[PDB]
RNA sequence: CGGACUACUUGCGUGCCUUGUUGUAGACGGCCUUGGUAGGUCUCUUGUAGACCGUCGCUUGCUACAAUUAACGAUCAACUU
RNA sequence: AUAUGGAUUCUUCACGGUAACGUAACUGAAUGUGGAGACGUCGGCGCGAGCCCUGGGAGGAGUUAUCUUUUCUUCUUAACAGCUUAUCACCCCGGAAUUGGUUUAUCCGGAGAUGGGGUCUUAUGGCUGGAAGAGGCCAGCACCUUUGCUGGCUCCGGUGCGCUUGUGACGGCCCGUGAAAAUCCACAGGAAGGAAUAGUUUUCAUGCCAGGUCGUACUGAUAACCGCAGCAGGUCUCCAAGGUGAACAGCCUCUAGUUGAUAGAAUAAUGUAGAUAAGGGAAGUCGGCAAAAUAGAUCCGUAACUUCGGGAUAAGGAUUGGC
RNA sequence: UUCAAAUGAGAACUUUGAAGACUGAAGUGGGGAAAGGUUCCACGUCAACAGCAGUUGGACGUGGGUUAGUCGAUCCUAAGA
């Protein structure tokens, strides 16, 4: 016979963590390397699209956020499989322009909504409204990667 | 029975780390209404002192 | 009466929309003398007479 | 819901150009006395009625399925 | 009038006998001395035969022997040996049956890394 | 020298099911067409196999038996006295 | 709105049956007739449906001190369509007293019975399609998540002064004979148009498009209505299980529903609602008031009087279980 | 009517479980017509009301809920106006 199973609904924290042995340092160093490579990749895309401007259309902020997040997940997918329980993105990719200090990551299905909602206003927020950068902008890029917490 | 006790073991999650011994992070809502639900008795007053 | 006329249903709809207590922001007005709704109606208390 | 006997009537009905769907339903049942046997029902959906052709002998059912027109959205079971 | 069909019935006793609370030889002996045929006990004059190979008890019958009667006799034997409240008699397919345990939840087993 | 990481990439063992294909399986009006089986019966432990009955079989020309023609005899199911 | 297919015709507007009539169709204006809508109540009889009862088998649950092949539960099939199915009624042959047929109930026949052969209404039932793919009853897995799956079985009968209900053919009753209109169809009529490269058909089959406005929750009552109230009052109707029994009486039970109505402790007198009482048997009281006694069913028996119909369960008697 | 647990500052009276009973199919069951008008349902919740109590409610506060070519009205006529 096999007996039974349950749901049990309650637990608390556990022990023997945050001591910084070699495996914890390996996880921290791997997360740091993935984050550095992602920042280099999104920097090269901004430079390619705006500081060379070869022949074609330029990338916008939602496309840059989408491509950076998919690159992060593609790189992280082959590290620490079936040995840790949780992985992925810790802070999503946010690109802020001058007055915006935190929290700008618009989805790819909201460009027409941004145009319709801000039709009527002036041009002080136009980089965030349309998605294209113009010269003279401070652009803040923020991202984060975790491995098992 | 020892096999079943070995199978039903523990495993803990990060939600149990960070959210165990925690209340809800939202307000009280003394009439018990939802987020986009009207409250015609208390819409015009926008501070709890008043 | 579960098979009624539009005239009866219209008066019932107005009497349903009139059945509310006093809004709380009205109590905070300058020289406010309304302290309660003195024309409140209840189904078992007093009848509408069609 | 109508029942069809003539297989030529079934073919000229399934070629009516206002049909779009036909189903083949297989159900296994018992004869007068002894044995189990398969039975295939062919249901073509018209605009006002559903027409059913019942084939008990499962040899010619495969021939009908093979010779059915290639445009209908045929649904098994 | 030559409808002398030989029905077969199979019972699987392997799970309680492997867990060590059942005895199929005693179960088969209970069947031989409590099957009634023409109203009388011990009238099994080549009408039914029951055999036991340690895992499957088989009845071959050419008398009035529906599966309800086999369930009735097995429940009576389990009551006599006080295994009702623990073991049930279920049908897998037609005329194949098995003994099963009722659902049991495990104990605590969390005292000084006991599990 | 380097591996903390499975991935980082044979075969060929042991097996699951669709199996694609036969092996196996051959499950059944095919009527290629004689004495009957649940036909009436009997040696045949029944029934077959064999026959007998000389011809059974819902049936019928063939004429006949208390023809169940004076119905006395064999065939299934309610509750009233 | 409309397009095909079929049907019709050069004998222009179809054929087949002695007939009752049949069919996938098979021109028909004005006008005029006919039918349906469209009808009381009671009585028994016949049939149909649902329920009730019951036998094998395949599942699930319970009892098991002793007994019980046991007790309970699941095993279902809509509108609609095709084929078929009837009491009544009608047609053909034939010619009836030794009068026959025939209903529970006595009516029918030379104005054509009995008999033989046929036609019709489709109430209603059956078999197929709808449709097993649904629903039901069980057995499992991952049973990680507010997420997902796979298997079996669902089958054959019986009965009846049963119960409720629908319906048919009859019968009784009346100085009582038991609505109307919208609406739909048919017939008579023969206006008018028409076949040869065609007209009629959308009353034959298939195909295309559309179907506006208002009501719709819940109670329907010992708390949603009216009585000033969350008042023992009042207020129209449908469905209706087992036993006992004549019974929709009373008593007990299944499905469903409720467990509401200020409570705790003691057991004085007097009450309200019930009961029993030796011997006597109305002596009580205005008055046998009230209570007791009687009581169902079977069988025997029954007076004066009478408007002859009744009185009448008159009066009186012998009985009643179980096996 | 009784027992335990849960909830709660507090439980004869709330919720679940365990028991004992009742209505007894001319029901304390399942639907509707007049009439009422949101009483339906969820969440929050106890000052007043529920002739004891109350954490409960047909109470108090905030919301959700009624979908038609085929069911009714609409159309017809009756006594009548
Ligand atoms: Mg007034
Ligand atoms: Mg013709
Ligand atoms: Mg009658
Ligand atoms: Mg119906
Ligand atoms: Mg209908
Ligand atoms: Mg009635
Ligand atoms: Mg007519
Ligand atoms: Mg409704
Ligand atoms: Mg309703
Ligand atoms: Mg209701
Ligand atoms: Mg009622
Ligand atoms: Mg009611
Ligand atoms: Mg009352
Ligand atoms: Mg009132
Ligand atoms: Mg009252
Ligand atoms: Mg009786
Ligand atoms: Mg009774
Ligand atoms: Mg006395
Ligand atoms: Mg006296
Ligand atoms: Mg005296
Ligand atoms: Mg005196
Ligand atoms: Mg008296
Ligand atoms: Mg007298
Ligand atoms: Mg109480
Ligand atoms: Mg009583
Ligand atoms: Mg009772
Ligand atoms: Mg009644
Ligand atoms: Mg409520
Ligand atoms: Mg509440
Ligand atoms: Mg109170
Ligand atoms: Mg109080
Ligand atoms: Mg409310």
UniProtKB/Swiss-Prot annotation, chain A:
Query: What domain of life does the native source organism fall in?
Result: Eukaryota
**Compartment list:** Cytoplasm; Nucleus
Further comment: Present with 45100 molecules/cell in log phase SD medium.
Q: What family is it from?
A: Belongs to the peptidase M24 family.
Record note on quaternary structure: Component of the nucleoplasmic and cytoplasmic pre-60S ribosomal particles. Interacts directly with REI1.
Function, in words = Probable metalloprotease involved in proper assembly of pre-ribosomal particles during the biogenesis of the 60S ribosomal subunit. Accompanies the pre-60S particles to the cytoplasm.
Q: What is this protein called?
A: Probable metalloprotease ARX1
UniProtKB/Swiss-Prot annotation, chain C:
> Is Ribonucleoprotein one of the keywords UniProt gives this record?
yes
Q: Which UniProt keywords apply?
A: Cytoplasm, Ribonucleoprotein, Ribosomal protein
> What Gene3D superfamilies does this protein's entry cite?
Ribosomal protein L39e
Q: PROSITE patterns in the record, alphabetically?
A: RIBOSOMAL_L39E (PS00051)
Record GO terms (molecular function): structural constituent of ribosome
User: What is one GO cellular-component annotation here?
Assistant: cytosol
Entry-linked InterPro entries: Ribosomal_eL39, Ribosomal_eL39_CS, Ribosomal_eL39_dom_sf
**Biased composition, Basic residues: where in the chain?**
6-19
The cross-references to SUPFAM superfamilies, in alphabetical order and at most eight, read: Ribosomal protein L39e
The entry's localization annotation reads: Cytoplasm
The GO annotation for biological process reads:
cytoplasmic translation
Record's family? Answer: Belongs to the eukaryotic ribosomal protein eL39 family.
Subunit info? Component of the large ribosomal subunit (LSU). Mature yeast ribosomes consist of a small (40S) and a large (60S) subunit. The 40S small subunit contains 1 molecule of ribosomal RNA (18S rRNA) and 33 different proteins (encoded by 57 genes). The large 60S subunit contains 3 rRNA molecules (25S, 5.8S and 5S rRNA) and 46 different proteins (encoded by 81 genes). eL39 interacts with YIH1.
Which HAMAP family did the record assign?
Ribosomal_eL39 (MF_00629)
Function field? Component of the ribosome, a large ribonucleoprotein complex responsible for the synthesis of proteins in the cell. The small ribosomal subunit (SSU) binds messenger RNAs (mRNAs) and translates the encoded message by selecting cognate aminoacyl-transfer RNA (tRNA) molecules. The large subunit (LSU) contains the ribosomal catalytic site termed the peptidyl transferase center (PTC), which catalyzes the formation of peptide bonds, thereby polymerizing the amino acids delivered by tRNAs into a polypeptide chain.
Curated annotation (Swiss-Prot), chain D:
Q: Which UniProt keywords apply?
A: Cytoplasm, Ribonucleoprotein, Ribosomal protein
Q: Where in the cell is it found?
A: Cytoplasm
Cytoplasm among the record's keywords? Answer: yes
Q: Name one Pfam family in it.
A: Ribosomal_L38e
Its BP terms in the Gene Ontology are: cytoplasmic translation; protein-RNA complex assembly
A GO cellular component entry from the record? cytosolic large ribosomal subunit
| Parts of the chain that traverse the membrane | none
Would the keyword Transcription regulation turn up in this protein's UniProt record? no
Instruction: Spell out the note in the miscellaneous section.
Output: Present with 50200 molecules/cell in log phase SD medium.
Partners and quaternary state? Component of the large ribosomal subunit (LSU). Mature yeast ribosomes consist of a small (40S) and a large (60S) subunit. The 40S small subunit contains 1 molecule of ribosomal RNA (18S rRNA) and 33 different proteins (encoded by 57 genes). The large 60S subunit contains 3 rRNA molecules (25S, 5.8S and 5S rRNA) and 46 different proteins (encoded by 81 genes).
What is known about what this protein does? Component of the ribosome, a large ribonucleoprotein complex responsible for the synthesis of proteins in the cell. The small ribosomal subunit (SSU) binds messenger RNAs (mRNAs) and translates the encoded message by selecting cognate aminoacyl-transfer RNA (tRNA) molecules. The large subunit (LSU) contains the ribosomal catalytic site termed the peptidyl transferase center (PTC), which catalyzes the formation of peptide bonds, thereby polymerizing the amino acids delivered by tRNAs into a polypeptide chain.
The identity of this protein, by name, is: Large ribosomal subunit protein eL38
User: What organism is this sequence from?
Assistant: Saccharomyces cerevisiae (strain ATCC 204508 / S288c)
Q: Gene encoding it?
A: RPL38
From Swiss-Prot, chain E:
| Protein name listed in UniProt | Large ribosomal subunit protein eL22A
Q: Which organism is it from?
A: Saccharomyces cerevisiae (strain ATCC 204508 / S288c)
Function noted in UniProt: Component of the ribosome, a large ribonucleoprotein complex responsible for the synthesis of proteins in the cell. The small ribosomal subunit (SSU) binds messenger RNAs (mRNAs) and translates the encoded message by selecting cognate aminoacyl-transfer RNA (tRNA) molecules. The large subunit (LSU) contains the ribosomal catalytic site termed the peptidyl transferase center (PTC), which catalyzes the formation of peptide bonds, thereby polymerizing the amino acids delivered by tRNAs into a polypeptide chain.
**Matches recorded under Pfam families:** Ribosomal_L22e
Q: Could you describe the subunit structure of this protein? A: Component of the large ribosomal subunit (LSU). Mature yeast ribosomes consist of a small (40S) and a large (60S) subunit. The 40S small subunit contains 1 molecule of ribosomal RNA (18S rRNA) and 33 different proteins (encoded by 57 genes). The large 60S subunit contains 3 rRNA molecules (25S, 5.8S and 5S rRNA) and 46 different proteins (encoded by 81 genes).
Please tell me what else the database record remarks about this protein. Present with 60400 molecules/cell in log phase SD medium.
What are the UniProt keywords, alphabetically? Cytoplasm, Ribonucleoprotein, Ribosomal protein
InterPro entries (UniProt xref): Ribosomal_eL22 (IPR002671), Ribosomal_eL22_sf (IPR038526)
Q: Which GO terms describe its biological process?
A: cytoplasmic translation
Lineage, top-rank taxon, reads: Eukaryota
**What is its subcellular localisation?**
Cytoplasm
Q: Which GO terms describe its cellular component?
A: cytosol; cytosolic large ribosomal subunit
């Amino acid at each position: 016979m096999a007996l039974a199973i349950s749901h049990e609904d309650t637990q608390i924290l556990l022990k023997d963590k945050n001591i910084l042995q070699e495996s914890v340092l390996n996880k921290y160093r791997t997360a740091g390397q993935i984050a550095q490579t992602a920042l280099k990749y999104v920097t090269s895309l901004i430079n390619d699209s705006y500081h060379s401007k070869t022949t074609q259309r330029q990338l916008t902020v939602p496309e840059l956020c989408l491509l950076t997040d998919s690159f992060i997940l593609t790189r992280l997918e082959q590290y620490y499989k079936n040995k840790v329980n949780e992985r992925g993105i810790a802070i999503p990719t946010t690109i802020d322009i001058d007055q915006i200090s935190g929290g700008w990551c618009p989805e790819i299905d909201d460009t027409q909504n941004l145009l319709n909602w801000n039709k009527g206003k002036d041009s002080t927020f136009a980089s965030s409204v349309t998605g294209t950068l113009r010269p003279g902008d401070l652009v803040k890029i923020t991202l984060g990667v975790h491995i098992d917490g | 029975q020892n096999r079943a006790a070995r199978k039903n073991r523990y495993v803990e999650r990060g939600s149990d780390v960070v959210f165990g011994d925690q209340d809800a992070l939202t307000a009280s809502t003394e009439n018990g209404v939802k987020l986009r639900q009207t409250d015609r008795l208390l819409d015009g007053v926008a501070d709890g002192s008043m | 009466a579960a098979q009624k006329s539009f005239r009866i249903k219209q008066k019932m709809a107005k009497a349903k929309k009139q059945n509310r207590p006093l809004p709380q922001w009205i109590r905070l007005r300058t020289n406010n003398t309304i302290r309660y709704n003195a024309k409140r109606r209840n189904w078992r208390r007093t009848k509408m007479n069609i | 819901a109508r029942e069809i006997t003539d297989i030529k009537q079934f073919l000229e009905l399934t070629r009516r150009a206002d049909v779009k769907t036909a189903t083949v339903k297989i159900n296994k049942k018992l004869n007068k006395a002894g044995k189990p046997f398969r039975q295939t029902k062919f249901k073509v959906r018209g605009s006002s009625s559903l027409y059913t052709l019942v084939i008990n002998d499962a040899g010619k059912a495969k021939k009908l399925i093979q010779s059915l027109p290639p445009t209908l959205k045929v649904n098994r079971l | 009038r030559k409808q002398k069909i030989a029905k077969t019935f199979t019972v699987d006793v392997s799970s309680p006998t492997e867990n060590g609370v059942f005895d199929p030889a005693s179960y088969a002996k209970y069947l031989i001395d409590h099957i009634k045929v023409e109203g009388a006990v011990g009238n099994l004059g080549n009408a039914v035969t029951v055999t036991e190979d340690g895992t499957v008890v088989t009845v071959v019958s050419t008398a009035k022997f529906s599966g309800k009667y086999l369930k009735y006799l097995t429940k009576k034997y389990l009551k006599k040996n006080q295994l009702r409240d623990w073991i049930r008699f279920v049908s897998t397919k037609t005329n194949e049956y098995r003994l099963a345990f009722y659902q049991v939840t495990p104990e605590e087993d969390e005292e000084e890394d006991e599990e």
